[PDB]
Structures are given as C-alpha cells and as structure tokens.
C-alpha cells in the first residue's frame, strides 16, 4: 500500500516537492547628474606662489 501512500498520494499534491558572511553584492560607482563644482579650481600652489622671495642677507 506504500506504493500509493507515497509518490502517488502526494504526487497529486505536488510532484516538484560553515559560518555565514554577508554576501558580496554589486557595489556601483557614482554617476552624478551634476558635478558639484562648476569650474574646477585653478592649481593652488604653482611656481609663482612657491618661490616668494630670495634672501639677500649677509650669510646669503
């Protein structure tokens, strides 16, 4: 009788039937609609601001 009890009785009720780390998930990169600064600032330390003055002291 077990022939029909299993896989003939339950087929009529459906035939198809160590540690955990957070999985890696697709981390997208920024694609801003607006660049947050209109005009990129001109360089802040160039030659004409690095060298300010020569010293002409007696040791110099």
């Amino acid at each position: 009788v077990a022939k029909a009890k299993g896989a003939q009785k339950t087929v009529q009720k459906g035939i198809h039937n160590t540690t955990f780390r957070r999985p890696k998930t697709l981390q997208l990169s920024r694609k801003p609609k607006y660049a947050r600064k209109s005009v990129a600032h001109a360089p802040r330390l160039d030659e004409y601001k690095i060298i300010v003055n020569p010293i002409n002291s007696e040791s110099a």
Binding site: V1, K3, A4, K5, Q8, K9, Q12
Partner: protein, 109 residues
C-alpha cells in the same frame, strides 16, 4: 490480502476502460476492471467499477479522487464494502466490448 473493489461515478466522456487502467496502475496494480455501457450501442454509462488487490489500496483512491472536479464533473469514487458485492461486476472485464451493428445486419438480412 483482501480484494478491494472500487466504484467510480460521473465519468467524463473519455475516461474509459483503457484510460482508467493506465491511470490507476501507478496507484497500484489493477486486476479486473469493467465500465458499464449501453446494451444497444455500447455507449458509456459514465460509471465504472474497478478492483484493487487490497482494500487499503482501494481506500487510498477513495480519499483522493473523491470529488475530483474533472472536465466540469465531480468524480464520485468510494469503497463499496464486500458484504454486498455481487459475483460479476467484472463479467467481461478487460475485454473490448462488442457493439453489434443492429441496423446494418438487418438490412443485409
């Protein structure tokens, strides 16, 4: 052990002797099967009696296909106890029923 006999009622047009045998076989082996048919034209009476080797197998079907909505028909099957089973529910069972062409044989005769 004990010869289980089963009745099936409200047969959809098509659920005939072969179709039932190839269906109930996977439930379990079926020995003697007859389906009541018209005496004259051999048309279906839409109810059949089947036998199972064990009443336990015979009662298996009675709790699944009972009230089985099929093609708009509610199949009626339940175990018929052996006290009132007659001798020949399976007289001519598993035999292609003979429908004789009464009209044509009359014209030839």
């Amino acid at each position: 052990k004990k010869k289980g006999v089963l009745y099936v009622g409200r047969l959809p047009h098509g659920f005939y002797e072969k179709q039932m045998r190839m269906y109930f076989s996977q439930f379990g082996p079926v020995l003697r099967l007859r389906m009541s048919r018209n005496r004259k034209t051999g048309s279906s009476k839409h109810y059949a009696f089947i036998e199972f080797e064990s009443l336990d197998v015979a009662n298996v079907v009675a709790e699944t296909m009972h009230n089985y909505l099929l093609y708009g028909k509610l199949l009626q099957c339940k175990v018929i106890p052996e006290d009132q089973v007659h001798e020949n529910m399976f007289k001519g069972a598993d035999v292609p029923f003979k429908r004789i062409p009464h009209a044509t044989i009359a014209r030839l005769q």
